[PDB]
Design a protein around this ligand. Structure first.
Ligand SMILES: CCCCCCCC/C=C\CCCCCCCC(=O)OC[C@H](O)CO
Ligand SMILES: CCCCCCCC/C=C\CCCCCCCC(=O)OC[C@H](O)CO
Ligand SMILES: CCCCCCCC/C=C\CCCCCCCC(=O)OC[C@H](O)CO
Ligand SMILES: CCCCCCCC/C=C\CCCCCCCC(=O)OC[C@H](O)CO
Ligand SMILES: *[Se@H](CCCCCC)CCCCCCCC(=O)OC[C@@H](O)CO
Ligand SMILES: CCCCCC[Se]CCCCCCCC(=O)OC[C@@H](O)CO
Ligand SMILES: CCCCCC[Se]CCCCCCCC(=O)OC[C@@H](O)CO
Ligand SMILES: CCCCCC[Se]CCCCCCCC(=O)OC[C@@H](O)CO
Ligand SMILES: CCCCCC[Se]CCCCCCCC(=O)OC[C@@H](O)CO
Ligand SMILES: CCCCCC[Se]CCCCCCCC(=O)OC[C@@H](O)CO
Ligand SMILES: CCCCCC[Se]CCCCCCCC(=O)OC[C@@H](O)CO
Ligand SMILES: CCCCCC[Se]CCCCCCCC(=O)OC[C@@H](O)CO
Ligand SMILES: CCCCCC[Se]CCCCCCCC(=O)OC[C@@H](O)CO
Ligand SMILES: CCCCCC[Se]CCCCCCCC(=O)OC[C@@H](O)CO
Ligand SMILES: CCCCCC[Se]CCCCCCCC(=O)OC[C@@H](O)CO
Ligand SMILES: CCCCCC[Se]CCCCCCCC(=O)OC[C@@H](O)CO
Ligand SMILES: CCCCCC[Se]CCCCCCCC(=O)OC[C@@H](O)CO
Ligand SMILES: CCCCCC[Se]CCCCCCCC(=O)OC[C@H](O)CO
Ligand SMILES: CCCCCC[Se]CCCCCCCC(=O)OC[C@H](O)CO
Length: 510
């Protein structure tokens, strides 16, 4: 009796939704069980059937809470190591983040149930992917966004990967939601017709994975090195640890000079202000040039502006052959999209006049422009993105140029230790190489350092948590994928057409 009440049946769906959401985490690296994405989304689509909209919203929230609570709780590692807060507060902040992101999946399920209450193929295959595109856009946009755990990234090594160079990863997000809805409808209606459509829609993109939208340029093959310094995270200012860090990177780099055309040091590899390291940079620049090598490295640049204040940038500088170092060189990249709660706090500008001055951080990061030219070194054009920025597919594509030779991302993922976070990050980085058909050079502090090929494949990699140099031959590519040509406006046009048709039909019951 009691287990069969209406409130109990709804609470069972909430529990199932939590589990199906958590199943979705298995789709991403390091687990890479890409069928888990479909299982997860089937649960979301099926458990929201035949619900009042507020019930469906609660189910979508709990599904999100399962997904995000199991999938991004690795942020705890950084909070607990550097936040100085008590254990229960650290857990609460993680629960808070997961609940915040689950508002968007609750939003999805509530609106889907409100406008498409009946269990139909139009709900699951037309309305749902268009609506999901919108709510996932809002999750990636509101308060500068956090578009982490999009299931399309789980197809980097999967049957649907050929879709990404055509319309971008969000087209895989779209198709996965559509295919999983049809499977949910087939299960619940016990009907073979939606299953056949789902398998057909899922299988049609398979041969696209064999398209090379690029041509290799073996006449430009070079040896590249990426120095994984494995520098432990600092807490106070210490010139002694700064000098040991420069020592590690220089000594690893010296024997590569004249052999690697390109050497890369990761995000903030030089943990001092650029203005404070002019002798070292000039001396290093001459050594590199005298041997025909170039260096690209992260650094912090507090740059005095015409208002006689300092704009502090998270920066990539260039040195050596084809990139003569100068503090006034334009051959540099300034991070545009700061990491929320890492490099700034959302809404902190609205609140600054209330804060005691002694409680404000010593300084804050400014932002580079949304589009910056490629870096140039040793005749090589590198489209750069620092750390988190590599997950912003449209922004990387908007910075990409036809004459880009390689994608470049440098990152310091040490904040998150041995967790799945660095693996999820790395998996998303690979999607950019596939989307734009360029090899990606990913240089990190302690992992994951790798060369990704122009179809997202791992061409070379070194283990995490080692002080080591990755040295390999890399070949640039040329050619434009359709997605490089367009960006995601074609997917948005399809989203509008599905959304228009679905909302029109939903209104037709008037
Ligand atoms: C029904 C779904 C949950 C309902 C919503 C409540 C949120 C859960 C809050 C606390 C659970 C305990 C969290 C797991 C145990 C703590 C984990 C921990 O202590 O982590 C320390 C360790 O160092 C890590 O590496
Ligand atoms: C097992 C623990 C008991 C749980 C009981 C079953 C679940 C309750 C039903 C729906 C979730 C509650 C409402 C969730 C949305 C309300 C607002 C919220 O909690 O999220 C705020 C967000 O954190 C802002 O940043
Ligand atoms: C264990 C519950 C038994 C219920 C049976 C059905 C379970 C639902 C299916 C998969 C859940 C597994 C979730 C994926 C595991 C995530 C691992 C994790 O959270 O790692 C923490 C941090 O994010 C990384 O360091
Ligand atoms: C009336 C028919 C039903 C309504 C529509 C059915 C859905 C169509 C699905 C995908 C669009 C396929 C074409 C768009 C994909 C390619 C777009 C693209 O990016 O290619 C352009 C670029 O210029 C290349 O170089
Ligand atoms: Se969804 C799982 C339900 C499964 C079994 C039901 C019987 C449970 C989701 C947990 C909600 C976490 C609430 C987060 C929170 O406390 O936010 C704080 C916020 O209000 C402060 O602004
Ligand atoms: C409701 C059906 C859901 C999806 C249907 C797909 Se058919 C299942 C077998 C599909 C077999 C594909 C290989 C799976 C995989 O991802 O391997 C993991 C490995 O890479 C590292 O864990
Ligand atoms: C990996 C996590 C798995 C957790 C185990 C769950 Se087993 C239940 C399978 C069944 C899948 C969901 C239940 C279907 C349902 O009840 O929805 C129909 C309803 O909407 C119509 O009104
Ligand atoms: C219903 C939703 C409410 C959301 C808020 C609940 Se967060 C649960 C905290 C759970 C507390 C776990 C204990 C952590 C710990 O490490 O305690 C030792 C510490 O004092 C030493 O630093
Ligand atoms: C009150 C405000 C809410 C409005 C409700 C409808 Se939002 C319509 C989406 C508008 C679509 C703009 C998309 C531009 C873009 O390219 O962003 C990348 C995107 O694909 C994903 O990251
Ligand atoms: C781990 C996997 C989780 C869920 C994946 C299964 Se998708 C369920 C499809 C459901 C299959 C459709 C059944 C059609 C039917 O039974 O009716 C036709 C009958 O009349 C012919 O004799
Ligand atoms: C990357 C985005 C690609 C978008 C392609 C849209 Se193709 C239109 C599919 C049509 C939508 C679902 C049709 C399934 C169906 O008809 O099954 C229910 C019926 O059998 C019950 O009698
Ligand atoms: C009905 C469509 C007609 C034409 C379709 C083009 Se060929 C169909 C094969 C479609 C292949 C999709 C499933 C592949 C898979 O199961 O994953 C492989 C696993 O090893 C990855 O880890
Ligand atoms: C007030 C509502 C919340 C604001 C909305 C945005 Se949610 C905050 C993002 C979650 C916190 C960021 C997670 C760290 C990370 O993504 O690092 C990747 C990279 O840095 C590797 O080193
Ligand atoms: C289901 C909703 C629950 C939401 C709150 C979950 Se808090 C669990 C924290 C778990 C934090 C991730 C663990 C990763 C790890 O073990 O690495 C540590 C090591 O690297 C350090 O250097
Ligand atoms: C249900 C159907 C969904 C299909 C969506 C993925 Se296939 C889309 C077209 C895939 C092919 C895109 C064409 C790229 C191109 O630029 O070729 C034209 C050029 O040759 C002319 O001068
Ligand atoms: C009714 C069908 C619904 C499905 C949507 C298909 Se959109 C057709 C694309 C048609 C292809 C046109 C390509 C235009 C181009 O490459 O201009 C460069 C510009 O995007 C740079 O911003
Ligand atoms: C219930 C939900 C149904 C869906 C209705 C909302 Se359709 C949003 C229209 C959005 C119209 C254009 C979006 C901006 C754009 O296309 O940016 C392209 C650029 O990034 C490079 O391709
Ligand atoms: C029962 C409490 C649910 C707790 C978790 C919900 Se999070 C949803 C965030 C966004 C809230 C909007 C989603 C709901 C919706 O759209 O239902 C249509 C109509 O607006 C209202 O009946
Ligand atoms: C309504 C409020 C809901 C949102 C709660 C947010 Se909890 C804060 C998580 C804090 C996560 C910290 C991530 C950054 C980091 O760990 O280092 C990054 C480094 O500074 C440079 O990339």
């Amino acid at each position: 009796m009691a287990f069969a009440s209406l409130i109990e049946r709804q609470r069972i769906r909430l529990l199932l939704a939590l589990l199906f959401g958590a199943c979705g985490t298995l789709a991403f690296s390091p687990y890479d069980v890409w069928p888990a994405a479909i299982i997860s989304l089937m649960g979301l689509q099926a458990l929201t059937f035949n619900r009042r909209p507020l019930q469906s919203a609660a189910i979508g929230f709990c599904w999100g809470f399962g997904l995000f609570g199991s999938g991004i709780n690795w942020v705890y590692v950084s909070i607990a190591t550097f936040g100085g807060m008590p254990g229960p507060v650290n857990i609460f902040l993680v629960v808070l983040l997961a609940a915040y992101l689950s508002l968007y999946t609750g939003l999805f399920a509530g609106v889907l149930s409100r406008l498409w209450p009946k269990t139909t193929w139009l709900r699951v295959a037309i309305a749902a992917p268009a609506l999901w595109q919108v709510t996932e856009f809002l999750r990636g946009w509101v308060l500068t966004g956090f578009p982490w755990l999009q299931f399309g990234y789980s197809q980097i090594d999967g049957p649907l990967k050929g879709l990404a160079p055509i319309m971008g990863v969000e087209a895989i997000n779209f198709l996965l939601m559509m295919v999983s809805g049809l499977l949910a409808l087939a299960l619940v209606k016990r009907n073979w017709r939606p299953l056949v459509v789902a398998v057909v829609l899922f299988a049609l993109p398979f041969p696209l994975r064999y398209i090379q939208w690029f041509t290799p340029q073996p006449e430009k093959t070079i040896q590249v090195s990426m120095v994984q310094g494995d520098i432990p995270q600092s807490l106070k200012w210490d010139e002694g640890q700064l000098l040991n860090t420069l020592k590690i990177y220089y000594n690893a780099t010296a024997p590569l000079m004249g052999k690697s055309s390109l050497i890369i040091w990761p995000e903030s590899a030089i943990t001092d202000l650029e203005i404070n390291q002019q002798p070292f940079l000039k001396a290093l620049d001459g050594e590199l040039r005298d041997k025909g090598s170039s260096l690209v490295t992260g650094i912090v640049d507090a740059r005095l502006n015409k208002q006689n204040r300092y704009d502090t940038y998270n920066t990539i500088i260039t040195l050596g052959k084809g990139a003569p170092y100068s503090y006034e060189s334009a051959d540099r990249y300034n991070k545009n999209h700061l990491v929320p709660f890492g490099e700034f706090v959302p809404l902190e500008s609205i609140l600054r006049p209330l804060a005691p001055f002694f409680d404000l951080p010593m300084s804050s990061f400014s932002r580079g422009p949304y589009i910056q030219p490629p870096l140039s070194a040793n005749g090589i054009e590198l489209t750069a993105a620092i750390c988190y920025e590599i997950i912003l597919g449209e922004q990387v594509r908007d910075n990409f140029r036809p004459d880009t030779d390689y994608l470049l991302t440098i990152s310091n993922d040490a904040w998150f230790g041995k967790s799945i976070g660095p693996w999820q990050h790395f998996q998303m980085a690979r999607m950019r190489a596939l989307e734009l058909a360029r090899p990606l050079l990913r240089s990190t502090n302690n992992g994951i350092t790798a060369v990704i090929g122009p179809q997202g494949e791992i061409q070379a990699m070194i283990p995490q948590f080692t002080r080591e140099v990755l040295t390999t031959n890399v070949t640039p590519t040329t050619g434009l994928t359709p997605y490089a040509r367009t960006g995601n406006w074609p997917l948005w046009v399809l989203t509008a057409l599905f959304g228009f048709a679905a909302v029109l039909m939903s209104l037709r019951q008037r």
